[PDB]
Design a protein around this ligand. Structure first.
Ligand SMILES: OC[C@H]1O[C@@H]2O[C@H]3[C@H](O)[C@@H](O)[C@@H](O[C@H]4[C@H](O)[C@@H](O)[C@@H](O[C@H]5[C@H](O)[C@@H](O)[C@@H](O[C@H]6[C@H](O)[C@@H](O)[C@@H](O[C@H]7[C@H](O)[C@@H](O)[C@@H](O[C@H]8[C@H](O)[C@@H](O)[C@@H](O[C@H]1[C@H](O)[C@H]2O)O[C@@H]8CO)O[C@@H]7CO)O[C@@H]6CO)O[C@@H]5CO)O[C@@H]4CO)O[C@@H]3CO
Ligand SMILES: OC[C@H]1O[C@@H]2O[C@H]3[C@H](O)[C@@H](O)[C@@H](O[C@H]4[C@H](O)[C@@H](O)[C@@H](O[C@H]5[C@H](O)[C@@H](O)[C@@H](O[C@H]6[C@H](O)[C@@H](O)[C@@H](O[C@H]7[C@H](O)[C@@H](O)[C@@H](O[C@H]8[C@H](O)[C@@H](O)[C@@H](O[C@H]1[C@H](O)[C@H]2O)O[C@@H]8CO)O[C@@H]7CO)O[C@@H]6CO)O[C@@H]5CO)O[C@@H]4CO)O[C@@H]3CO
Length: 587
């Protein structure tokens, strides 16, 4: 059991002959004096001495009477002669603010991943992710208090299900002391934050997501060594976990087990279906500037998870175009299943920001994504990072008076949901929040109060996009196969009209056409592959979303009139600042 140190280290229930208690265990090879202090001892550092197994590094001590509920720490004399209380790095629950003491609770039971949840993570599945910071999705109105994990189970889970998302992605829920880190500056990697309730309340939340048919992705932070509360720095007086500004010693073995075990812990004991690693560049940079320990650590972890928990996937954000992030390790790869497409996010948002009269000069911003699509397995992300620190909301990036901003936004979502790659959308984006994300307050749900409005219109579109994207294989089945995408009109720069097909394994095609200027286009003829009757299944200008309701108004038959090198063509209305998707009707 090298892979799962959490099953041994930390506090666990045990039976000594016939008297029950808790076996404590801490890894510290140097130390020279560790005792167990808690609420079973009156915190007396005399009363209970541990005893090092110098082979392993682990101080171990059974304590009769010690049981679930009670707070504890370890009393440490350093390798360097100093007296410190250390919190258990393997604390599965931590005391509430302020404080620090670890909590005896043991391990939750193992969750078996179902075939349906394994299926939902696969390359050929529709994957649409709702990214959520639990501390700021909603608040109780009269007191501004956080929703608990249990209230989130009753509110967030049905909401994301209704909106048609397949996955919920949580910003890090490991215990962390400052709300402003958003979770990325942790102190307790094995403890769910007490902000929202108990570890069992959190498990209840995950079970509720699962019962509603949602997979759960957790932001996992093996790249951020703790920096607060003296959590993990200089643990036994030496550099135990860190390197000789603070970074993990991934090269060390017990540290790597600690981190790999932590991944196994979330997946196996909480039923987490995927893990996302942020800031991968910071791990593998700063062999020249390459940290080889980190790269090996990432390849390792991905390899082990693939062996130990098939069905679970990892995804990475990496910002330096390191090759093969989502490619096999036995080539140049890092072994991740998916990679965030940051380039696509920058390119398409730059394009949407432009006055539409200038989009003619920047057609490359929309077409470029296809050229490198087949080099990584991409998620198209509109994430929390893009709506803070003066970057504005996505809505406010759009040009024009308010009605034109909303039209632009609708068209862009229509494009994003049709373009190759999986989808991720941060909370608030789906109803076109005006203000930036504030981690210290609720999202602006008030925008949706009162009579039906443009914000409701966007929210209905995102739901229709999700449900349409999931229903039709062509929209999601071959994201990563060139057969899954073909341009129909790639070079109408003058008019900023772009048309492509998405294609399923059976060869059925859905035509996607976007018109990125305020000029409506009538009798727009373009070559198609499958002649017959074609009908809109999505139109971002629909009155249902507070659009102008322009479009093709029923079935349109193709013509045997050659266009764009193709023998048959369609001649359509393309609504202004809008995208439409069309399906072929059987006859
Ligand atoms: O009259 C008291 C109160 O009774 C009811 O509240 C109970 C509630 O129903 C239970 O859930 C329970 O509470 C715990 C809660 O579940 C935990 O989350 C936690 O609370 C934390 C918050 O989650 C966290 O966000 C933060 O809270 C801060 C707020 O973010 C911040 O805005 C501010 O809060 C001030 C309010 O904005 C302001 O309205 C005012 O609050 C008054 C309310 O207006 C009024 O309704 C009433 O509160 C009721 C409540 O409605 C019932 O549901 O009187 C309030 C007078 O105080 O003043 C607030 C400042 O105190 O600051 C807070 C604090 O930082 O941190 C908290 C702390 O962790 O812990 C909760 C209890 O420990 O019990 C409560 C109480 O019975
Ligand atoms: O800035 C980059 C790029 O910008 C301009 O290119 C745009 C172009 O003007 C638009 O027409 C459109 O391109 C789309 C194109 O019209 C579609 O036909 C389709 O393209 C598919 C190809 O048909 C198909 O062959 C395949 O392409 C693969 C190649 O077979 C293979 O060789 C390799 O591509 C590599 C090149 O061989 C190699 O030269 C190297 O590339 C650089 C070019 O030399 C250089 O010109 C420039 O490209 C410009 C271009 O000049 C502008 O006009 O930078 C290139 C590096 O980025 O490396 C290449 C990749 O390793 O692999 C490719 C891809 O698998 O598949 C493609 C994709 O399905 O889709 C096109 C994309 O929409 O948009 C482009 C980009 O905006």
């Amino acid at each position: 059991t090298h892979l799962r140190p959490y099953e041994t280290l930390g506090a666990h229930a045990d039976t000594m002959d016939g008297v029950t208690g808790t076996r404590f265990s801490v890894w510290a090879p140097n130390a020279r004096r560790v005792s167990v202090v808690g609420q079973f001892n009156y915190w007396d550092g005399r009363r209970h001495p541990m005893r090092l197994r110098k082979e392993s590094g682990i101080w171990e001590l059974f304590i009769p009477g010690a049981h679930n509920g009670q707070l504890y720490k370890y009393e440490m004399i350093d390798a360097n002669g100093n007296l410190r209380l250390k919190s258990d790095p393997y604390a599965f629950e931590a005391q509430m603010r302020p404080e620090t003491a670890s909590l005896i609770c043991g391990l939750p039971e193992k969750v078996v991943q179902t075939e349906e949840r394994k299926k939902a993570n696969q390359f050929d599945a529709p994957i649409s992710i709702y990214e959520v910071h639990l501390g700021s999705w909603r608040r109780h109105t009269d007191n501004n208090f956080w929703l608990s994990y249990r209230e989130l189970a009753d509110q967030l889970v049905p909401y994301a299900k209704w909106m048609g998302f397949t996955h919920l992605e949580l910003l890090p829920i490991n215990e962390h002391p400052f709300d402003g880190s958003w979770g990325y500056q942790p102190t307790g990697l094995y403890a769910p934050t007490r902000r929202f309730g108990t570890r069992d309340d959190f498990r209840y939340f995950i079970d509720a997501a699962h019962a509603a048919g949602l997979n759960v992705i957790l932001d996992w932070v093996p790249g951020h060594f703790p920096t607060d509360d003296f959590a993990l720095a200089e643990f036994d007086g030496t550099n135990l976990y860190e390197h000789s500004t603070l970074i993990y010693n991934y090269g060390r073995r017990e540290v790597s087990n600690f981190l790999v075990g932590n991944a196994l812990y979330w997946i196996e004991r909480f039923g987490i279906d995927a893990l996302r690693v942020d800031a991968v560049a910071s791990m593998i940079y700063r062999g020249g500037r390459e940290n080889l320990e980190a790269i090996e650590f990432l390849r390792n972890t991905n390899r082990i998870l693939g062996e130990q928990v098939s069905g679970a996937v990892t995804m990475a954000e990496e910002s330096t175009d390191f090759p093969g992030v989502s490619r096999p390790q036995d080539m140049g790869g890092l072994g991740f299943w998916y990679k965030w497409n940051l380039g696509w996010m920058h390119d398409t948002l730059d394009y949407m920001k432009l006055d539409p009269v200038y989009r003619q000069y920047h057609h490359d911003k929309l077409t470029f994504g296809i050229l490198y699509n087949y080099t990584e397995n991409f998620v198209l992300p509109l994430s929390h990072d893009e709506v803070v620190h003066g970057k504005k909301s996505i809505l406010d990036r759009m040009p024009g008076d308010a009605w034109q901003k909303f039209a632009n936004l609708r068209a862009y979502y229509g494009w994003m949901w049709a373009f190759p790659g999986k989808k991720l959308l941060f909370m608030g984006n789906e109803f076109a929040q005006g203000r930036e994300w504030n981690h210290d307050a609720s999202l602006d749900w008030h925008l949706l109060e009162g009579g039906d409005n443009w914000h409701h219109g966007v929210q209905r579109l995102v739901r229709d996009l999700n449900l349409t994207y999931r229903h039709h294989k062509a929209m999601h089945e071959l994201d990563f196969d060139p057969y899954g995408f073909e341009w129909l009109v790639v070079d109408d720069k003058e008019r900023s009209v772009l048309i492509f097909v998405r294609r399923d394994k059976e060869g059925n095609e859905i035509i996607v056409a976007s018109n990125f200027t305020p000029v409506p286009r009538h009798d727009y003829r373009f070559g198609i592959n499958q002649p017959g009757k074609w009908r809109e299944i999505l139109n971002t200008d629909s009155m249902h979303y507070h659009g102008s309701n322009a479009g093709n108004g029923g079935t349109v038959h193709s013509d045997e009139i050659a266009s764009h090198g193709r023998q048959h063509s369609l001649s359509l209305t393309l609504p202004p600042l809008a995208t439409i998707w069309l399906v072929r009707e059987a006859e």
